[PDB]
Amino acid sequence: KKIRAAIVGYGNIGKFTVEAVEAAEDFELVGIVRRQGAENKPAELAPYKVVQDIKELEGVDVAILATPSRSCKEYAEKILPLGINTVDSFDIHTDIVDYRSALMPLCKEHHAVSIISAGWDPGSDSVVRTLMQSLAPKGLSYTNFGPGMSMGHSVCARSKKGVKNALSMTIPLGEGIHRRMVYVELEEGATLDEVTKEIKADPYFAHDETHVMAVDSVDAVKDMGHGVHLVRKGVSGKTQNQRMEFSMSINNPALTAQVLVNVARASMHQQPGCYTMVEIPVIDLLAGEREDLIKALV
Amino acid sequence: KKIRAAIVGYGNIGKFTVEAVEAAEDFELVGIVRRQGAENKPAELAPYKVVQDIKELEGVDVAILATPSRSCKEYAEKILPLGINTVDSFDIHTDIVDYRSALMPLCKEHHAVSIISAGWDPGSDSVVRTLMQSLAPKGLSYTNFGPGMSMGHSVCARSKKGVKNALSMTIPLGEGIHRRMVYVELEEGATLDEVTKEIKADPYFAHDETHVMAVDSVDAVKDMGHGVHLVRKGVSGKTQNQRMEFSMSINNPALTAQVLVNVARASMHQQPGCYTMVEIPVIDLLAGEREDLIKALV
Numbered sequence: 322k323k324i325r326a327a328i329v330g331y332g333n334i335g336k337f338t339v340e341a342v343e344a345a346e347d348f349e350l351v352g353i354v355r356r357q358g359a360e361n362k363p364a365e366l367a368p369y370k371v372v373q374d375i376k377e378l379e380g381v382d383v384a385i386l387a388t389p390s391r392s393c394k395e396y397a398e399k400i401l402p403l404g405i406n407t408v409d410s411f412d413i414h415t416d417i418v419d420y421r422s423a424l425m426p427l428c429k430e431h432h433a434v435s436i437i438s439a440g441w442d443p444g445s446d447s448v449v450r451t452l453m454q455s456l457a458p459k460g461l462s463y464t465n466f467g468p469g470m471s472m473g474h475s476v477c478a479r480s481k482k483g484v485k486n487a488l489s490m491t492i493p494l495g496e497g498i499h500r501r502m503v504y505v506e507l508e509e510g511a512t513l514d515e516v517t518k519e520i521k522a523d524p525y526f527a528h529d530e531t532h533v534m535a536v537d538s539v540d541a542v543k544d545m546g547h548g549v550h551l552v553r554k555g556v557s558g559k560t561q562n563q564r565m566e567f568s569m570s571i572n573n574p575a576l577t578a579q580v581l582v583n584v585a586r587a588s589m590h591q592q593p594g595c596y597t598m599v600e601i602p603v604i605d606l607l608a609g610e611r612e613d614l615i616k617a618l619v
Numbered sequence: 620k621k622i623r624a625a626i627v628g629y630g631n632i633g634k635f636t637v638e639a640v641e642a643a644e645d646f647e648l649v650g651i652v653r654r655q656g657a658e659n660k661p662a663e664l665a666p667y668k669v670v671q672d673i674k675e676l677e678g679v680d681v682a683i684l685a686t687p688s689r690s691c692k693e694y695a696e697k698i699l700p701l702g703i704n705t706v707d708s709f710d711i712h713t714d715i716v717d718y719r720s721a722l723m724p725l726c727k728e729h730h731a732v733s734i735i736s737a738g739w740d741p742g743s744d745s746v747v748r749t750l751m752q753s754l755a756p757k758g759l760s761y762t763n764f765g766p767g768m769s770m771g772h773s774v775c776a777r778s779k780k781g782v783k784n785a786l787s788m789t790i791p792l793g794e795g796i797h798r799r800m801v802y803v804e805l806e807e808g809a810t811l812d813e814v815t816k817e818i819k820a821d822p823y824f825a826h827d828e829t830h831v832m833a834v835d836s837v838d839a840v841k842d843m844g845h846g847v848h849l850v851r852k853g854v855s856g857k858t859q860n861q862r863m864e865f866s867m868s869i870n871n872p873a874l875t876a877q878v879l880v881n882v883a884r885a886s887m888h889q890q891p892g893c894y895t896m897v898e899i900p901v902i903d904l905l906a907g908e909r910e911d912l913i914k915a916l917v
């Protein structure tokens with residue numbers, strides 16, 4: 322009747338994934354899996370079992386991996402043999418094919434389902450981008466992120482010398498082109514130019530319009546808001562100039578969470594194997610009877 | 620290697636469906652099926668066999684039904700026993716559940732696939748609307764058509780007394796609310812008021828802001844341009860005020876055609892049965908190896 326979900330990692334996503342599972346009337350939250358188990362359990366996790374190994378939790382249908390991207394395959398390969406299903410928001414566009422081909426046979430062998438790269442991008446947007454391609458298979462598509470924070474670029478800026486803290490904003494200038502607004506807390510000694518030169522040198526910044534500013538508090542300029550403008554102009558049949566846009570103004574980690582819950586729900590209805598969200602019927606993402614949902618949405 | 624498609628009906632969709640099949644390098648056009656066979660074969664159908672019964676055409680994988688909506692079930696029930704697959708743009712939102720559960724067993728018994736209600740709305744938009752619902756399952760969605768021509772309302776206006784010709788434009792006023800701009804050729808004798816009162820009385824117009832104008836030529840004001848603004852404001856997990864928009868500026872029948880070709884291609888990869896487009900992985904709509912497509916779009 323209800324789906325028994327365990328969350329692996331209580332990072333930013335984890336926090337919102339609890340909120341998203343708490344809100345799904347068709348879900349039970351078995352427990353959260355942390356490196357540090359129950360220790361210093363935060364207030365909002367009061368009413369849930371927290372452990373160090375998923376093996377400690379009982380009758381788990383699906384593991385939502387709120388892990389880093391580097392950590393996803395390792396934890397998946399670990400959690401599948403147990404017969405448990407694994408959704409994740411793995412976000413390294415370039416590796417997605419190999420990570421898929423990896424879990425593929427392991428999923429089948431253990432009669433269980435892995436859905437991978439299931440956030441809003443990749444995930445949600447990957448579906449829209451694919452539908453859009455189909456609507457006019459000749460022409461050009463453009464993915465336009467922000468304004469929003471970039472966990473990757475934010476990190477790749479902290480990493481540089483003179484940089485105590487740093488947040489990199491990602492600003493869309495259209496046609497897949499972007500602007501980087503980096504805000505920094507200077508370590509005692511170093512100057513804005515040293516740091517600026519040091520950032521712009523890195524491949525993550527060297528090919529994009531970058532502006533580096535110094536601020537008292539990075540935390541005082543942070544906000545989990547984010548967006549996207551997906552755009553296609555192209556040809557349906559041989560009829561030119563067909564135009565379509567998809568846009569979001571969303572809370573990034575809040576939405577990534579909700580999609581993970583959705584592909585968790587969706588894994589309970591697939592032939593054992595590994596799946597990107599473009600391989601999943603979008604109706605499986607929702608709660609309810611196919612007939613009732615078709616009546617409402619088609 | 621290639622998919623052998625027959626088109627049933629050389630109406631406006633039919634015309635564009637040829638153009639769309641001509642453009643799919645993974646398709647072969649076996650023939651067009653008309654009531655009136657080859658008889659006044661139009662120039663652009665020169666190089667294709669045209670017949671009166673699909674039985675005349677040979678080694679057909681999939682029948683694209685470019686028929687009216689009233690006619691779809693009849694032609695499907697006819698073409699399935701022959702072992703052939705049936706895609707259609709059946710567009711009566713209310714009947715879609717019954718039409719599905721009708722073909723369902725018939726498709727299975729004959730180990731073959733029917734995809735139904737596969738235009739841009741329903742079809743394309745049915746997918747986006749469903750994904751959007753998933754992204755924030757609490758709140759409100761709004762489908763906003765036009766500006767574009769309305770075949771249904773256009774017809775329901777010709778039907779009224781004093782109306783020689785009539786075209787009904789559909790104008791979005793947001794939040795699912797619409798305006799009807801009806802343009803009429805008066806049958807010599809009748810007056811604009813009589814006709815106006817006579818239209819607005821009808822359920823198709825009585826609940827919508829309607830403006831009725833009299834014009835010299837209806838054909839002089841026609842255009843197959845059209846669009847939609849799909850809109851959801853709602854809640855991801857328990858995070859409020861998540862916003863997302865999907866919009867098109869397209870040639871209506873041109874796009875309906877291209878989607879039909881897409882669900883024709885998609886039917887070649889499904890367990891026998893009846894499917895709405897929300898039941899089909901969006902990747903199946905495209906030509907190519909899953910790996911190549913995932914590399915590009917996810």
Ligand SMILES: NC(=O)C1=CN([C@@H]2O[C@H](COP(=O)(O)OP(=O)(O)OC[C@H]3O[C@@H](n4cnc5c(N)ncnc54)[C@H](OP(=O)(O)O)[C@@H]3O)[C@@H](O)[C@H]2O)C=CC1
Nearest residue numbers: 330331332333334355356388389390410440441442443577
């Ligand atoms: N598709 C999309 O658009 C989005 C996808 N993402 C995905 O989410 C990931 C992280 O999201 P977020 O929650 O904000 O990140 P955080 O860094 O805040 O959280 C990661 C958590 O994973 C757990 N963890 C498990 N194993 C390890 C390990 N070996 N090293 C470090 N931490 C580990 C930790 O929690 P604990 O110690 O309690 O176990 C940690 O808090 C990204 O790497 C990306 O894959 C990110 C944003 C949106």
Ligand SMILES: NC(=O)C1=CN([C@@H]2O[C@H](COP(=O)(O)OP(=O)(O)OC[C@H]3O[C@@H](n4cnc5c(N)ncnc54)[C@H](OP(=O)(O)O)[C@@H]3O)[C@@H](O)[C@H]2O)C=CC1
Nearest residue numbers: 628629630631632653654686687688708710738739740741
């Ligand atoms: N999803 C969406 O928004 C859209 C949906 N549609 C769908 O497409 C349908 C038809 O559009 P379109 O092709 O422009 O319409 P037309 O009226 O221009 O074409 C209908 C064709 O159906 C064939 N036909 C076969 N049997 C019959 C019959 N008994 N009575 C009438 N026609 C018959 C005919 O082909 P021939 O004359 O050569 O024999 C005829 O030309 C709509 O009713 C709707 O279901 C339309 C466009 C957009």
